[model samples]
Target: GEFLATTLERIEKNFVITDPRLPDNPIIFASDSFLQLTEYSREEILGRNCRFLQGPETDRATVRKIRDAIDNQTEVTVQLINYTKSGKKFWNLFHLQPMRDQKGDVQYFIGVLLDGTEHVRDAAEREGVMLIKKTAENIDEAAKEL
Candidate 1:
């Protein structure tokens, strides 16, 4: 019950929020940019585990790292090869962060995906990470204020 709508307008990038309190921590919110990035409808991905984007080429080590981070509620960035709707493999700069409320209870985990296939560079990665981070913090900021 806060200014989520205003914050959403500022989020002009790809991101997803998953509820850890839920049974599987499935995705509860998928931004329009996220839907455009992954080429999936809201009905398809919402409430589904983010692992559906992973396939054979996905790195085992990186996947495990993400698992540990989620279990531990830590923010981390990892570059892994992920598949798209039509099975097209692409480089993914995946960043995950925990969004906790004023009471320190993690309300959701934010996952930001930046496609490394279009243009790969350190500068882009830097901005994507920081920008996505700001958006997540913005939501958490609103959440706690309420």
Candidate 2:
């Protein structure tokens, strides 16, 4: 949607927004930083679920944690190893939150990703969490206002 593109374009973090109501909750929007980080072209990720990022070494338990949170309509942060387009693996510090609509319905899920393969600072991890939460709130508020 134009609303999502207009608002999320300026963000510098690697992130994606998914519509829960859609099949497999496909990514509705992906930030430019996300495409760069994943080594995936924009076309590759569109209408795709995040499961493609999982590979041989990706932890099942961590993935289940995210699943549980999604089922509960809650927020969760986890570090999982994921593969890029070129088969390169990276530790991803992922934070996902549900964006509720005016009727308190879960409209979208916002996921922020950070490369944990590098020396990730605590401050950066904290900021990613804030970004997801803040962005979710921004959209919900704007939708409510409209």
Candidate 3:
């Protein structure tokens, strides 16, 4: 019951679900988790495209992956750097799968996100340190010539 309630709340707060099977073309379901993640309230997100979560640094390749998967009606997993309403950047591991009708036509998609920033940051730190060391070595070698 807790899971069902939480799922329903998530549906209510975070997204607008539209289906031909439903009378309303766009129905709002706001979730607290969604609001917290994006720092946007239900009223703010209403009638807005979710792409607003993306920013200048959001990878076009990841967007392309989403488009390709949706077009092919297949599941997709991708890492996206998305910006929050407060302009904080976060790494999102997006997993999306299509829901199909009884006739096997794609109806809707179910999406979930995993935050991958900590792992990414750790790797980046190592690479950054190595680059700095290499650069310092090059500088030292050049100084010896001068």
Candidate 4:
């Protein structure tokens, strides 16, 4: 137990550890890196649902996928949107896994979050440029035919 906590502390990953048996699956512990990313204090997050980080831009389909995985006691990875305490949206590549006890009963869930806003935005910009180029080429060909 101590070893696990120590190892987790040393990692730079954002993590939220939640007790499945608790009401609403409230967060039991959150890594310091996670709090830093969300700009939230531990006291504000503990005993609260992680969904509080979600905002209007968050995809309902992605949320449903996570819910289905949790209901089935499985792991799921999804790229979705999340908002910081200041209400700024960020692309979140999220991974969630269920932790089981000796009896194979679900005990806790570990959630890992990776910020992907820049990557997603860069990809979208590239797509937009490609579309513009293709449209220009099409227009040029039409003009030549005329």
Residue-level lDDT of model 3, residues 1-146, one tens digit each, is 12222344443222223232443322234356667787876677645545677899888988989778866877666668988889998886565555565587756544554444743445664554444344333322332222
Query: Please, what are the lDDT tens digits per residue for candidate 4 over residues 59-124?
Result: 899999999999999887667889999998888767777666658777777777766565344676
Candidate 4: C-alpha lDDT:
0.71
Give all candidates' CA lDDT scores.
0.77, 0.77, 0.55, 0.71
User: Candidate 1 has which clashing residue pairs, if any?
Assistant: none
The Cα error of candidate 1 at residue 99, in Å, is 0.9
Local error of candidate 4 at 14, Å?
Answer: 0.4
For candidate 4, the 10 contiguous residues with the lowest summed lDDT are 137-146
Task: Please provide, for model 2 over 90-117, each residue's C-alpha lDDT reduced to its tens digit, 9 standing for 90 to 100.
Answer: 9887888887776988888888777767
lDDT of 1 by residue, 1-146 (tens): 22232454236777777887877889877777776678777778878999999999898999999999998989888889888788988888888888887688887888877777753568887887776667667656644443
Checking candidate 2 for backbone clashes, the offending pairs are none
Estimate TM-scores for all models. Answer: 0.82, 0.80, 0.62, 0.74
**Candidate 3 clashes between residue pairs 3 or more apart in a chain or in different chains:** 12-29, 12-30, 13-29, 13-30, 13-31, 14-30, 14-31
Query: What root-mean-square deviation over C-alphas does model 3 reach?
Result: 17.4
Off by over 4 Å in 2: 1-7, 118-146
